[model samples]
Target: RFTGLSLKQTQAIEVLKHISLPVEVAVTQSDQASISIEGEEGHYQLTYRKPHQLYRALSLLVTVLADKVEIEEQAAYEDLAYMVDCSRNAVLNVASAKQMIEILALMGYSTFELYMEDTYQIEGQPYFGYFRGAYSAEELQEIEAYAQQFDVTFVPCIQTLAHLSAFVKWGVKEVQELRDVEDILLIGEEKVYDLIDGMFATLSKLKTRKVNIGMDEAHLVGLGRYLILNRLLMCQHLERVLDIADKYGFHCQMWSDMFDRVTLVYWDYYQDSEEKYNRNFRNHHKIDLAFAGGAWKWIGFTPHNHFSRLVAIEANKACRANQIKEVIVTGWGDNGGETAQFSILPSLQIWAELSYRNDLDGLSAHFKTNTGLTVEDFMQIDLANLLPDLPGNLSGINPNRYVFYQDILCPILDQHMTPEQDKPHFAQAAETLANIKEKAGNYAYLFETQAQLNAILSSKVDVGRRIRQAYQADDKESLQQIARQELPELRSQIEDFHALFSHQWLKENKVFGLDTVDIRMGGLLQRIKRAESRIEVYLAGQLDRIDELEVEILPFTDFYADKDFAATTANQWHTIATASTIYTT
Candidate 1:
């Protein structure tokens, strides 16, 4: 019945046949998935342009015919790729990858990209991904084969320049010699290119002819061990690397950020107008450019939808004006990789609508029809952001990193709020998350984990603030009351948090990097226990006062300031016992 079908067409046939759609349907090859009603009302004719398009049309057709709805939708783009970053201290397992690929294919995506910067093993590189959980070649090959069954291209996206800090961090002491500032690869070294060559060789075993050679943010390219800051030298490095990539017969694309750096016109937020369009037109002609537009999954618990959609709109306009066809919606996982990749579903959904659909009308319903998740349910992921701030604190500022970095005991985040003033707001945020969790359906556990974590943070702060007040009043009795009453309860809440967090973490990522979560949570538990003991002993007349609680701290403000939000700290892995900025750790 489906003898000459491609994997995608066969899958479409599978979907249509499974549902037993009440129509005699015919499918043939064409430039795009186009369908027409013919003969009787239940009869139809369909022509699929490609395997992916075939699935997309049939998937939509089954839904429409079942509901008896009319649809005039057709895909706009020929290529729709979704890239997942398995680096940033969280490498997803094969099962998760397969699950995601199936969902992506059903959503009409034609390509799947796995962004790994030294998170995949290379032959003879014992130290490449040691302990940090790199994927074996067999695993990647298996992933590729699994993706092929759904007619999705499994493309390899590897970093060839900066963002190699993971390599320097886990590699042998000799490999440690390659570090400069953060994660920028040392240019002008043969070993650097050799390492990249090894990565290309490892990924060459895959079926994709296209490769993304990441040279995005090598801002300090020649500054590390190379001892010079020459842009020309960096250009030469790129050319040489591309020549090496040519050997693999790969079509290569690099991040356009460095080119912007060279042009001295940085790509920060700007209003879209004729002047900006002309500027992009002129700038894009300077080189063949493919913009790596961010979907705002980088630094937050969930996406800021309006912000990300505006960014995609601006980027798409610029690409169209400049005649640049390629646009990769980069879902980056910077910092401790605290944000889950699935949290960006709404953002990706918006992009899909913008790319394929002509209007926003019925878009939400269309997304629900495709994903089995309503737009509201998908949008509920943003409720995770409620944990860090009030319901509508939109200053284009992210408080998640700051909240995560706040001191567990002698709290400084209280500088902005009294216990009386803050508890209600935190309570409201927790309640909002709970409501979202209840309505989240299959994604309930994910929201449940976030809601529970937020609930714990709320209680932790409320208790910490009161304990501080008691210490301020030199009230040993009050401190003892809190220790006997609240401290034990807070300890129990943390234990519950860890259990839920462990389940959530292992569900999405490998167990290797889960210790980072354990270290932070375990460290918080230790601080609570130590504080509890001190309070107990102080009441026994063994000490004069708790010195840590009594230590004076300056009131910290300006949390919404741009400078404060952009600030970074040294202890990137876990929070220290002090206040810090919102910069990536």
Candidate 2:
């Protein structure tokens, strides 16, 4: 029914439609059971059909929602949107963004709020790297068209007051008087408004109905601005910006976090409700403003059940009274590293499910069917159902075997190579390299994954060369001596690649524990580990083999003195591995 709605969601809906099987919620063990489980420690039917099969099955489950909602086929779909700030540290691309949009939409999301604050253009208007890669003005139009095919709305976002350092392309030099680095906003600078006008002008040309002006995290700028002119002046500046949004006939959405800091003067004090307050308009700032809730604050599965609910309920109340309608819940990394991307997706799922279905447990149980990949698989199933993932009937990768091999290999590599050093002190080059060759050489199922993994694995050649370089520069007697003494520790240092290359958690034992992220990524990390580990193991083995040919020919210092050289080599190798690994996949 929702075919061609959005490229990503189309794929998800299609796949779900393709893989549904007859479900029977009966006991696995019974007197009449064909597969006996009464006396068995394990049951054959206990496992899911395999990840890809399960991906299809879970997507089919989501189609049940549209059936349940029973809306007029024409009603605009409700979205539980989670807008991530990717420009901060992560480099994002068009395909990745489209893939994410598909995943979310299939999980029942229908709109995407791209938090392209001023910094998206802060680097420069024509910037083409880092988080601001070129999916330029023209490409964005194509993407918008693509989104419309899936019934997805693209909400353009730009920085309004704070969070504009991303757009200060030139620097505070042009507007030093406006510089407010402490809170990270421009002071009395007109450039903030200038940029806002330019951005909205550009977006107005696109097929857009709404816009998000990121007003969150004004810490640095707020402090500076407030100190300069107190409170009323700042509020006046906000009014000026809101007018610009109003001028262009665009609904304005701004951050409400600032209200918390200046609750004294700017916003009406809601905490003291006992006074002469209108329950309709609690703290009268005289403006009906949209609010963005901080992601790190929420604790429950349903949006209404968590602390995040306070902001939404309050925003809704204010909107009802003041004709304000838009509200966004922001999932920020909160100065932390990339979120546990898997756990984080559920946050958005919860938002959409409760915002629409009003059932958190039901939705979670629904999403849990595909090894927590329903969100990821939504697009695939959607595409398979209404449209087709492979229309020409190209042969499918044995997704079952592919998923299984990846799942099994990710943890195996993380556990072995990530945390512990592969000790080659017991040198047996023939046995060790042979062990590596045997273990990784022949998984015919892993051809594609292994091909990628081998590319990462091949990064060791650079490392090996680096090792030879370091040995030559050192005062060490010979490269052979350096190998015997220094290579073992180098092997240990290379172990860091396990985390650097893939999402497999080596040291983190979090509340949910480590789960495999990117089967291919983990596979690549695995091969890197195996390759680096085997090389050191073989090098140690080679030294031993050389000693077999002649004992005193090598100095005792050759083995121990190489630690410095080994440590340096190890550091350089980790850098090289990181440099070579593909970041986007």
Instruction: Estimate the TM-score of every prediction.
Output: 0.84, 0.47
Error of 1 at 409 (Å): 2.8
- Compared with the true structure, all predictions reach lDDT values of 0.63, 0.37
The top-ranked prediction according to lDDT is: 1
Candidate 2 residue lDDT tens string, 1-585: 221133544454464431243222112222231111111222112112111122222343433433222111111112334565544423234554555555564454556666555323323343212233323566557656655545567776656666544344444454444456532556456765675576666676678757666555565554655466644545776677667767777765555556521211112212222122234345545534443434331111101112233233343344335433333546543221122232344445554444433335445454544223343222121111111121221111111111112211112111112101112211222233223333332211112222222222222223333333443464234444434544433334334433432332221112111223333334444653453444345456453322111212112122223332211101111222232345444
Model 1 clash count equals 0
Structure candidate 1, residue pairs in collision: none
lDDT accuracy of residue 192 in candidate 1: 71
Q: Model 2 residue 20 lDDT?
A: 40
Runs of candidate 1 with Cα error greater than 4 angstroms are 1-8, 11-23, 32-40, 66-70, 74-76, 170-182, 228-230, 260-285, 300-310, 313-324, 387-396, 416-441, 474-478, 550-559, 562-585
Question: Could you tell me the C-alpha RMSD of candidate 1 in Å?
Answer: 4.8
User: Clashes per prediction?
Assistant: 0, 42
lDDT of 2 at 26: 18
